[PDB]
Design an enzyme around this catalytic site. Structure first.
Site, PDB file in Angstrom:
ATOM      1  N   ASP A 111      33.992  68.601  32.280  1.00  0.00           N
ATOM      2  CA  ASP A 111      34.892  69.536  31.613  1.00  0.00           C
ATOM      3  C   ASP A 111      35.783  70.454  32.434  1.00  0.00           C
ATOM      4  OD1 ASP A 111      33.401  71.448  33.177  1.00  0.00           O
ATOM      5  OD2 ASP A 111      32.260  72.011  31.275  1.00  0.00           O
TER       6      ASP A 111
ATOM      7  N   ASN B 147      33.140  69.168  37.536  1.00  0.00           N
ATOM      8  CA  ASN B 147      32.475  68.681  36.440  1.00  0.00           C
ATOM      9  C   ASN B 147      33.450  67.997  35.561  1.00  0.00           C
ATOM     10  OD1 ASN B 147      30.762  71.411  36.775  1.00  0.00           O
ATOM     11  ND2 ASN B 147      29.663  69.554  36.983  1.00  0.00           N
TER      12      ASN B 147
ATOM     13  N   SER C  33      35.252  72.538  34.616  1.00  0.00           N
ATOM     14  CA  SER C  33      34.719  73.475  35.710  1.00  0.00           C
ATOM     15  C   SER C  33      34.257  72.747  37.049  1.00  0.00           C
ATOM     16  CB  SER C  33      33.576  74.092  34.949  1.00  0.00           C
ATOM     17  OG  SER C  33      32.456  73.083  34.854  1.00  0.00           O
TER      18      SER C  33
ATOM     19  N   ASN D 276      28.193  77.612  38.531  1.00  0.00           N
ATOM     20  CA  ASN D 276      29.400  76.602  37.637  1.00  0.00           C
ATOM     21  C   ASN D 276      30.566  77.855  37.358  1.00  0.00           C
ATOM     22  OD1 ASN D 276      29.955  74.264  35.933  1.00  0.00           O
ATOM     23  ND2 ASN D 276      30.303  76.276  34.669  1.00  0.00           N
TER      24      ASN D 276
ATOM     25  N   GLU E 273      20.452  70.529  45.052  1.00  0.00           N
ATOM     26  CA  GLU E 273      21.830  70.922  44.400  1.00  0.00           C
ATOM     27  C   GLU E 273      22.904  70.772  45.629  1.00  0.00           C
ATOM     28  OE1 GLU E 273      22.749  71.426  41.682  1.00  0.00           O
ATOM     29  OE2 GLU E 273      20.940  71.758  40.590  1.00  0.00           O
TER      30      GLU E 273
ATOM     31  N   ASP F 256      31.198  73.435  40.173  1.00  0.00           N
ATOM     32  CA  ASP F 256      29.727  74.179  40.925  1.00  0.00           C
ATOM     33  C   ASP F 256      30.179  74.394  42.173  1.00  0.00           C
ATOM     34  OD1 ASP F 256      28.627  73.528  38.444  1.00  0.00           O
ATOM     35  OD2 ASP F 256      27.782  71.852  39.037  1.00  0.00           O
TER      36      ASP F 256
END
Ligand SMILES: [Cl-]
EC number: 3.2.1.17
Length: 129
Positions: A48, A46, A50, A59, A35, A52
Site C-alpha cells: 500500500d 508494504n 506504507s 506501520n 517482526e 514498517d
C-alpha cells in the site's frame, strides 16, 4: 542495534511491557524476534506504500509520520525514524497504544502467525529478570 534475547526482555520489562494488557513478556520478545530479528533499524515497505519501522515493525499508515505515506494519521505523535533508535522507549510507548486499540497483539501479523498459542515463556527462559 541488534539486541540479544535476554537483553531485550530486560529492557521491555523495565519499560512496563510485562503483562501489559494481559500479555506476558514472552509474547513481546517472540513478536520482536519474528517482526525484526531483534534489530532496531529494520524497515520494510508494504504494497500500500506504507512502511514498517523498528523492533516491532510499527506501520506509517496509522502510527507515525514518514512524510511519504499519503492520508496517513500519526496516532503516536512521532517521526517514524524515532522508532529505529537503540533506545526502545518510543517503540514501547507506541506499542502500548497499538495493543490497547481493540485487537490486542493480533495487530502484529508475525505474533498471530508464529507466537499466538505457542509456549512463549520459552523466549524468556534462562534470563536474569
Ligand atoms: Cl507471518
Amino acid at each position: 542495534k541488534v539486541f540479544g534475547r535476554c537483553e531485550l526482555a530486560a529492557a521491555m520489562k523495565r519499560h512496563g511491557l510485562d503483562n501489559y494488557r494481559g500479555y506476558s513478556l514472552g509474547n513481546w520478545v517472540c513478536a520482536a524476534k519474528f517482526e525484526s530479528n531483534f534489530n532496531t533499524q529494520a524497515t520494510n515497505r508494504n504494497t500500500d506504500g506504507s512502511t514498517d519501522y523498528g523492533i516491532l515493525q510499527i506501520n506509517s499508515r496509522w502510527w507515525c509520520n514518514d512524510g511519504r505515506t499519503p492520508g496517513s494519521r500519526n496516532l503516536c505523535n512521532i517521526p517514524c525514524s524515532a522508532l529505529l533508535s537503540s533506545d526502545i522507549t518510543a517503540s514501547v510507548n507506541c506499542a502500548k497504544k497499538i495493543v490497547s486499540d481493540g485487537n490486542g497483539m493480533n495487530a502484529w501479523v508475525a505474533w498471530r502467525n508464529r507466537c499466538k498459542g505457542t509456549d512463549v515463556q520459552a523466549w524468556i527462559r534462562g534470563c536474569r529478570l
